Design brief:
148 residues, Globin-like_sf, GDP-dissociation inhibitor activity, Globin-like, Neuroglobin, mainly alpha, globular, 70% helix, phosphoprotein, EC 1.7.-.-, binds protoporphyrin IX containing FE
């Protein structure tokens, strides 16, 4: 496809340094939606502030995990049916550790921001569209995980 290459080449710059880009993604996330902050419960503490999240090794390990799932989605961009079953468990595994569904849209907007910031003009409207389609299929898979 056109779309599949737009994804792959955009993701290339990001995969150089997933934690750095993932940190943008999560900092944006809490900027948009500070109420997600308590859902990362790591040794019975809530982060008080967004920046607290940035000092948690477990939060950063979570950033790595997020980026690796998106990396898988990119590897399978031509056919995402192969990751559907995982993504559904991930969604289930989300709700099971407490996380809400609505907020995955906010993750998607955060991902787009991170790409846009990282790629600047190379992030064309068609890349945005393609990413929005890629990520949208991730979330649709994942949403099955909230059985229904
Ligand atoms: C609002 C968004 C999110 C919140 C609040 C959140 C929170 C959590 C929490 C609390 C866990 C359990 C503790 C941990 O393993 O770090 C978890 C696990 C996980 N999250 Fe997220 N998460 C979110 C989004 C995402 C997204 C978008 C992805 C991937 C695209 C992702 C990938 C994972 C993975 C891979 C795990 C480990 C799951 C397993 O046990 O197999 N998360 N997340």
């Amino acid at each position: 496809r056109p779309e599949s290459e737009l994804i792959r080449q955009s993701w290339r710059v990001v995969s150089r340094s997933p934690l750095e880009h993932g940190t943008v993604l999560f900092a944006r996330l809490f900027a948009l939606e500070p109420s997600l902050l308590p859902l990362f419960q790591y040794n019975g503490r809530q982060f008080s502030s967004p920046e607290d999240s940035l000092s948690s090794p477990e939060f950063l390990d979570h950033i790595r995990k997020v980026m690796l799932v998106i990396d898988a989605a990119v590897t399978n961009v031509e056919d995402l049916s192969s990751l559907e079953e995982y993504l559904t468990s991930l969604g289930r595994k989300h709700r099971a550790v407490g996380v809400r569904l609505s907020s995955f849209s906010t993750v998607g907007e955060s991902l787009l921001y991170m790409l846009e910031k990282s790629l600047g003009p190379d992030f064309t409207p068609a890349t945005r569209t393609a990413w929005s389609r890629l990520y949208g299929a991730v979330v649709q898979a994942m949403s099955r995980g909230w059985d229904g």
